[PDB]
Design a protein around this ligand. Structure first.
Ligand SMILES: COC1=C(OC)C(=O)C(C/C=C(\C)CC/C=C(\C)CC/C=C(\C)CC/C=C(\C)CC/C=C(\C)CC/C=C(\C)CC/C=C(/C)CC/C=C(\C)CC/C=C(\C)CCC=C(C)C)=C(C)C1=O
Ligand SMILES: COC1=C(OC)C(=O)C(C/C=C(\C)CC/C=C(\C)CC/C=C(\C)CC/C=C(\C)CC/C=C(\C)CC/C=C(\C)CC/C=C(/C)CC/C=C(\C)CC/C=C(\C)CCC=C(C)C)=C(C)C1=O
Ligand SMILES: COC[C@@H](CCO[C@H]1CC[C@@]2(C)C(=CC[C@H]3[C@@H]4C[C@@H]5O[C@]6(CC[C@@H](C)CO6)[C@@H](C)[C@@H]5[C@@]4(C)CC[C@@H]32)C1)CO[C@@H]1O[C@H](CO)[C@@H](O[C@H]2O[C@H](CO)[C@@H](O)[C@H](O)[C@H]2O)[C@H](O)[C@H]1O
Ligand SMILES: COC[C@@H](CCO[C@H]1CC[C@@]2(C)C(=CC[C@H]3[C@@H]4C[C@@H]5O[C@]6(CC[C@@H](C)CO6)[C@@H](C)[C@@H]5[C@@]4(C)CC[C@@H]32)C1)CO[C@@H]1O[C@H](CO)[C@@H](O[C@H]2O[C@H](CO)[C@@H](O)[C@H](O)[C@H]2O)[C@H](O)[C@H]1O
Ligand code: HEC
Ligand code: HEC
Ligand code: HEM
Ligand code: HEM
Ligand code: HEM
Ligand code: HEM
Ligand code: FES
Lengths: 403, 16, 232, 194, 403, 204
């Protein structure tokens, strides 16, 4: 209503925010498949929050009842199995969407100036997401849950001096137990969700401060019409809102297909050994991380030394933070970067996929050799970026976006 | 039909 | 090497026979404590009174979980390994693994219970289905001849052409109630019931997912039209 | 953009919104449905057999029936004579609007006068009233003749379970379906034979 | 750093937000004792979130273990008793501070135009706080907890038709049980904390959009210096930040005194019967609400009918929502309102306190009569406001804040 | 009913030790203290762990175990007509004065199932388990001469020590709380002066 909105606008900047962030907010008109994943990440975060709130209505964060409570959700709670599968598939889809989001950032140089803070907030979001998923995977209290938590927290025992004390303090016990379960449940259900929501708010605010990149890397703000609107810019609402609605429907089709027909996804979204209750005295023949942690695992497994392996695994994630300063290309988009940048992006993607694929299996000779090679390539993609971004010859970026 | 399908394995012989 | 089994979760009779087998030969050591008798009866089509009379041996109520008197610690002490809860064993191991495991027990005097398992070597489980299967041994029997996947059947009778192999699971004749096919069907029904127990929402999941996907296709048509239009 | 086709845009927006609202309702169905009583809740309860021969005069015992407390009170004579004297203070003296077995006395609300079996849950917001058999407590006033006093909002019932007038509780305390298996043993949960 | 802040400001709205909200945001300079309580409410909300997160690491939301887990916090967890006392005393202090905040609003007409949205968001915050505190009070699973949950959920049973079904659906069971406990734990620990954070953000955003009232009710924006700064305005940072620091220290002194010497506060912060495990069959002889819920409970106890009592309680809270439109006074502050407004505000305060005091004890004849009189006075304060705010004669509002 | 005031001293290790002895011998038969551990009781009462295990742990439990008992609540509720509540928090549920008056107010009432009634807790389901010590108390309460091991003063000390242990059991953090609170308040008074001065400096 006109009068109601006039009353609100005098007392709340509703119309002002709407015209500053969604309408009258002109994003590049050449977004492609790779720009669906921010909105899909928001959708998956909302799905995780809702389904987690509902699982918490029935979950028991105790070592004696966690697994039994999960089965109670799966069988006794009306549609509880739907909510649980939504949550597990939503964690896996959160990591799928976020990895594709980060790979878009890599492809189109979206981390470069002025979006360095956007990239840093996104990486903080990624760290929070990894912590959240790790602590959630302990909640079912299956064999995989318990033993993956055991190994991951023993990693903190690799710190030379304070490692063992730090690991014990994190566990809250001399081993992984119900104390660790309840603690990780509290962190996973409130603390990290709050941190993630705040980080997402900061991320979107920084983006809207500096504006979106585009597949061509063209700074659309340079060319503006008489009204001040970029020539290659269109209002986010309604054009990209409807585009993101279509993307959300497609994502929901895939998401519901997985939920209702293949919730386990061949044992990758719901690992088979995790359907057995945690046993402190019998460890699985082969213990592997959830798929979305597998690459870094491979890196850690590729290093013969324990402390060096932990340091390398941490650096594999920390280097993405400095990525904005590693890239010295005069152009943003891979479309106009030299052959070296394209080759190294291909190498990095292949190495990441191979690291994930070989970290999901028991160690093998070819697997170990390829994991070490891919660790070298993964770190070289970043370490050599400041050099091969300068050595290459880049194409001239068009004044107007293509399409 | 179901009852025959579900008959317990153990059969006990009782006096009378 | 596992053996494939085609498990039909819509077969109420097979699931009922599997539930009977589980209640009689299995719940002595194994619990199904994440699963209630009431839900099992509802999904298998067993009347509640019939479920109470025929499958509930522990004095539990219809709505009670399929708990057993054997405690995990006691059974671990007695057998050397705790008999795991079998509600989700179909998901933990898969139906093919269970089908091959329950048919792979063979006499092995070197073992604590006189038996070993091809699928689960040095398993701590006694061969509790020996009365049905009969004495199974690692002996010499006729196996279909295969040469690089060149599998020979009899063109006329349609039965396999066989040669003797001396490292095969052979059931000693006239040692069990059921022949090979009858024990195969018994194990198939048991594994079908276990598959239902692991995933009791499978059929409803498929139905609901079909309807959800139909709705999402409809909504996609509308959203795609609202997008491509309004992008002109 | 050249000549946007309105109406088509309006129709598509409206249709997409309606279909999305239907999908939102469907996606809400799991969350709203999971709040209905689960299989854990639906365990129900079986009838409880209570030995009532040991209840001293003017005393009461609590029987756990289907998760609820049942006041089984052995009523002495004096309170039985006093009960008819309270009919002017009771909203439903004849139990016309309350819940009770068809075979209990409309006024005494029990199979036998000397024993009263009452579902001990207040009919206003559902809490077990405190049993106050005393005649004239200072707090309960001089007109009190024994009965029940809800400690939540002060709901007066007489010893027959009948609610007083002007009380948060609108109905008499429910009488459970119970029988006398023996002169001194009752069962709560099964109706009495006709 | 200057260079670091220049880098951030080109990528984040750091300095602009700081200078729009905290610095260069000119609030009236005559804030008094009654204006400490917004910052104190913020502090108590932060304390509740932090202490509740730490309690959730050791709490077991099951009917079998909730009470035992609370005692585990009190006895086995190092300093867990401190955290639990901070949490319970912080709930009590949250309601103390919020009630004083609302009473400041009543005194100085801070609900009046243009702050109607501020007041409505505050009332939504108060509703969320009532729900949050009620659901938290069920979590210990004491006798108080169980029977208060029973009464309050049965309140929905008063609805003539869908009441019983709605109450059963809210319970998740045919009686208050571990299902209700777990569901309320989920709502208390995530859903309502998120809703409260959002509502607090909206509340503060509305306040900053319309500006803060002051004790004199003088619209300081009318008079401005040549720089556009109000004559009676001072930058909120640093002056009111330091004033709020002093207020926070005083509040912390009182808060820690209660925590470490009087955590029960005579059984009003931690109720004595709540130290007994919940009993479905034994109702405590004195089943009374927490003190901050007593005034409304009294209102419900004062009405002889069940449904009308429930409506009267609902209407006691709902009436505060429409307060911005009930007050037709030409002046904001009680300092310049007529004798009728002052008398009726005194009447409302006395009636609220008397309802809370008699709602905190078992029914009595004088207690009932005074509850019934104060129930009519509480409602008359609102129902008669549109009349006695016009009948009264108001003093002229000064053009400058007095002090 | 009218209660008798008792001055409970939670720093009296000897009194709390005597109360713990009385609780373990006369009270843990039917009542659990399942929310506290033998180890913490020993630590707070100054009892060596070996001495605690030998003298106060009768159930065969470990020092770090909760003070559980064999009598299950359902069985006890059936037997006595009421479940003996866990007494770990009873000093907070009832208060030390109520406990002191209750444990000394048992008198003989043949009309009751256990032959006793209580002035503080009328028609209570507790048998008079301290009758051997107090003696035969009959109704004003008077103890029949030469019927108990202890006189009125000696029994009051026994109840006082027991109530003192119950008082400690309900609130084992009270002494540590008053110690920590003193420093927290001292720091806050110290911090207030700096905050107050800082505010005064800016508001010139
Ligand atoms: C097989 O195996 C393996 C796998 O697995 C299967 C694997 O996957 C992997 C691969 C691994 C991965 C890639 C997975 C990665 C997963 C992770 C990253 C998970 C890591 C998560 C953890 C282990 C959690 C660790 C958590 C830590 C260390 C952080 C701890 C944080 C705390 C405890 C917080 C501290 C609390 C505080 C400070 C309280 C707040 C204090 C206050 C001051 C509050 C405010 C108080 C006041 C206001 C009062 C005082 C008042 C003041 C200040 C005065 C002034 C007043 C004012 C208010 C102004 C590997 C290698 C593996 O081999
Ligand atoms: C003596 O005793 C007494 C006391 O005590 C001791 C007392 O104190 C009191 C005093 C009483 C008080 C004053 C206390 C008052 C306290 C309270 C008010 C507490 C009341 C609290 C409750 C009982 C809780 C009640 C809760 C209710 C009724 C609300 C329930 C809410 C839900 C269940 C949530 C609903 C869930 C939904 C809808 C899920 C979300 C749905 C979606 C659609 C999610 C999104 C899905 C998608 C995106 C997928 C579909 C995709 C779409 C839409 C397509 C398009 C795509 C896009 C994304 C655009 C008294 C009287 C007393 O005498
Ligand atoms: C035996 O065959 C070797 C094959 C290579 C590999 C996997 C081996 C040992 C250490 C590995 C490095 C540790 C540093 O870790 C990283 C990250 C940590 C940094 C501090 C140093 O660099 C690597 C770039 C560096 C690194 C991850 C790259 C690859 C190294 C095994
Ligand atoms: C039956 O009246 C009760 C009192 C007088 C009753 O005063 C009234 C005082 C006012 C008040 C609080 C009352 C009702 C509605 C209240 C309003 C609803 C609306 O809501 C709001 C919000 C919602 C909006 C939609 C509308 O507006 C408001 C602005 C409005 C509102 C909140 C304002 C105030 C209203 C009670 C007289 O009590 C007698 O005394 C005994 C009572 O128990 C009864 O005696 C029997 O039972 C005893 C057991 O104790 C035995 O002692 C006896 O032996 C045995 O005979 C006897 O029957 C009974 O009459
Ligand atoms: C129906 C006759 C039965 C089926 C089907 C299964 N069991 Fe048992 N079982 C027993 C023990 C002591 C073990 C542990 C052995 C070890 O860990 O080495 C087992 C194990 C299994 C397994 C393996 C599950 C896994 O995840 O590895 C399956 C699939 C299984 N059992 C199925 C003991 C007993 C027992 C006591 C005499 C009985 C009657 C049964 N098992 C019956 C069945
Ligand atoms: C079994 C013979 C008991 C022994 C020995 C002791 N107590 Fe007891 N206690 C018992 C019962 C059956 C009850 C319930 C009585 C009822 O009508 O509800 C109790 C109760 C108490 C209480 C009341 C606590 C409360 O109401 O909140 C207290 C304070 C108490 N018991 C203390 C107590 C002490 C100090 C004992 C050793 C001296 C003791 N009890 C022994 C059963 C038995
Ligand atoms: C980024 C957001 C989140 C992610 C990525 C995430 C991830 C996960 C994962 C991977 C699991 C293991 C599921 C399984 O294998 O069974 C899990 C479990 C769980 N999560 Fe989270 N989660 C998120 C947010 C939340 C929130 C906000 C809540 C509650 C408010 C929550 C509550 C739970 C509960 C109760 C469980 C145990 C039940 C179960 O395992 O299904 N989660 N989570
Ligand atoms: C996990 C939850 C996340 C959410 C909800 C989210 C949300 C969004 C949204 C809505 C956008 C705008 C639309 C789009 O560009 O797709 C965006 C852009 C962006 N995101 Fe994310 N994001 C998340 C995580 C991440 C992560 C992990 C990274 C990188 C490490 C990241 C980096 C970026 C960058 C650089 C941009 C802007 C680049 C450009 O304009 O092309 N985000 N984010
Ligand atoms: C419970 C958490 C709350 C928080 C954190 C909060 C926060 C604040 C803050 C920081 C202020 C400005 C500083 C101050 O006035 O002290 C404020 C002002 C205000 N608040 Fe709230 N508030 C809360 C609840 C409420 C409630 C329950 C109400 C009313 C029902 C309310 C109504 C108002 C009004 C009317 C103002 C403007 C006061 C004026 O301008 O004089 N708030 N709030
Ligand atoms: C406005 C915010 C909140 C308020 C007013 C509030 C209020 C309360 C109250 C009154 C209790 C009862 C405590 C007792 O009587 O012992 C409680 C319990 C509890 N609360 Fe909250 N709460 C809030 C936020 C939170 C949050 C955000 C969490 C978790 C992140 C949380 C976790 C808990 C837990 C675990 C309990 C049970 C343990 C205990 O009783 O100490 N609370 N809450
Ligand atoms: S609970 Fe009985 S009057 Fe409210």
């Amino acid at each position: 209503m006109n009068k109601f909105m006039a009353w609100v606008d005098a007392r709340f900047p509703a119309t002002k925010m709407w015209e500053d962030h969604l309408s009258k907010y002109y994003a590049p008109k050449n977004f492609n498949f790779w720009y669906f994943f921010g909105s899909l990440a928001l959708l998956v975060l909302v799905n995780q929050i809702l389904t987690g709130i509902w699982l918490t209505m029935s979950f028991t964060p105790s070592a004696e009842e966690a697994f039994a409570s999960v089965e109670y959700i799966m069988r006794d709670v009306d549609y509880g199995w739907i909510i649980r599968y939504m949550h597990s598939t939503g964690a896996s889809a959160f990591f799928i969407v976020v990895y594709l989001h980060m790979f878009r950032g890599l492809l189109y140089g979206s981390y470069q100036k002025p979006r360095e803070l956007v990239w840093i907030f996104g990486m903080l979001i990624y760290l929070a997401l990894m912590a959240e998923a790790f602590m959630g995977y302990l909640l079912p209290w299956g064999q995989m849950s318990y033993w993956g938590a055991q190994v991951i927290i023993s990693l903190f025992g690799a710190i030379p001096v304070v490692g063992e004390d730090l690991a014990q303090w994190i566990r809250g016990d001399f081993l992984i137990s119900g104390i660790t379960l309840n603690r990780f449940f509290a962190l996973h259900v409130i603390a990290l969700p709050i941190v993630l929501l705040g980080l997402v708010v900061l991320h979107i605010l920084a983006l809207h401060e500096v504006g979106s990149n585009n597949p061509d890397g063209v700074d659309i703000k340079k060319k503006k019409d008489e009204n001040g609107v970029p020539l290659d810019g269109i209002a986010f609402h309604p054009y990209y809102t409807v585009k993101d609605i279509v993307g959300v429907v497609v994502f929901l089709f895939i998401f519901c297909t997985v939920i209702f027909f293949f919730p386990e996804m061949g044992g990758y979204f719901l690992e088979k050994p995790n359907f057995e209750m945690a046993n402190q005295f019998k460890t699985p023949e082969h213990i592997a991380p959830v798929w979305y942690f597998t690459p870094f695992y491979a890196i850690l497994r590729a290093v013969p030394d324990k402390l060096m392996g932990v340091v390398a695994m941490g650096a594999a994630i920390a280097v993405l933070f400095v990525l904005p300063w590693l890239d010295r290309s005069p152009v943003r988009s891979i479309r106009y970067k030299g052959w070296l940048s394209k080759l190294w992006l291909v190498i990095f993607a292949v190495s990441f996929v191979i690291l994930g694929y070989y970290g999901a299996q028991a160690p093998s000779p070819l697997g170990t050799t390829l994991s070490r090679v891919c660790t070298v390539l993964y770190f070289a993609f970043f370490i050599l970026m400041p050099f091969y971004t300068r050595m290459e010859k880049t194409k001239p970026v068009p004044e107007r976006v293509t399409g | 039909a179901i009852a025959k399908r579900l008959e317990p394995v153990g059969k006990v012989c009782v006096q009378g | 090497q596992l053996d494939h089994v085609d498990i039909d979760l819509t077969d109420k009779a097979a699931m009922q026979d599997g539930a009977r087998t589980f209640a009689n030969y299995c719940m002595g050591c194994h619990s199904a404590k994440f699963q209630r008798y009431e839900r099992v009866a509802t999904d298998l089509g067993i009347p509640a009174d019939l479920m109470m009379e025929k499958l509930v041996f522990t004095g539990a109520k219809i709505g009670d979980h399929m708990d057993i008197g054997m405690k995990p610690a006691d059974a671990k002490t007695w057998f050397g390994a705790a008999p795991p809860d079998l509600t989700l064993v179909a998901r933990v191991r898969g139906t093919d693994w269970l089908y091959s495991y329950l048919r792979s027990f063979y006499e092995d005097p070197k073992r604590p219970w006189g038996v070993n398992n091809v699928i689960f070597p040095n398993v701590g489980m006694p061969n509790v289905l020996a009365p049905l299967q009969g004495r199974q041994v690692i002996g010499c029997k006729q196996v279909q001849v295969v040469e690089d996947g060149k599998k020979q059947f009899d063109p006329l009778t349609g039965t396999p052409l066989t040669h003797e192999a001396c490292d095969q699971l052979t059931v000693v004749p006239k040692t069990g109630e059921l022949n090979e096919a009858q024990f195969d069907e018994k194990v198939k029904n048991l594994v079908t019931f276990l598959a239902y127990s692991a995933n009791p929402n499978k059929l409803a999941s498929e139905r609901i997912g079909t309807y959800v996907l139909l709705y999402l296709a409809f909504f996609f048509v509308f959203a795609y039209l609202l997008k491509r239009e309004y992008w002109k | 953009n050249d000549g946007v086709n309105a109406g088509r845009r309006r129709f598509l927006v409206a249709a997409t919104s309606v279909v999305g609202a239907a999908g939102a309702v469907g996606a809400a169905v799991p969350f709203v449905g999971s709040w209905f009583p689960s299989a854990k809740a639906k365990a129900a309860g079986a009838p409880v057999q209570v030995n009532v021969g040991k209840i001293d005069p003017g005393q009461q015992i609590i029987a756990e029936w289907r998760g609820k407390p049942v006041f089984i009170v052995h009523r002495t004579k004096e309170m039985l004579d006093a009960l008819p004297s309270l009919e002017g203070q009771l909203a439903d003296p004849d139990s016309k609007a309350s819940e009770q077995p068809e075979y209990v006395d409309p006024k005494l609300r029990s199979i036998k006068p000397e024993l009263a079996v009452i579902v001990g849950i207040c009919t206003h917001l559902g809490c077990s009233p405190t049993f106050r058999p005393e005649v004239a407590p200072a707090d309960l006033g001089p007109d009190w003749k024994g009965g029940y006093f809800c400690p939540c909002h002060g709901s007066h019932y007489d010893l027959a379970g009948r609610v007083y007038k002007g009380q948060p509780a609108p109905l008499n305390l429910p009488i459970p379906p119970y029988t006398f298996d023996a002169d001194d043993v009752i069962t709560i949960g099964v109706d009495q034979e006709k």
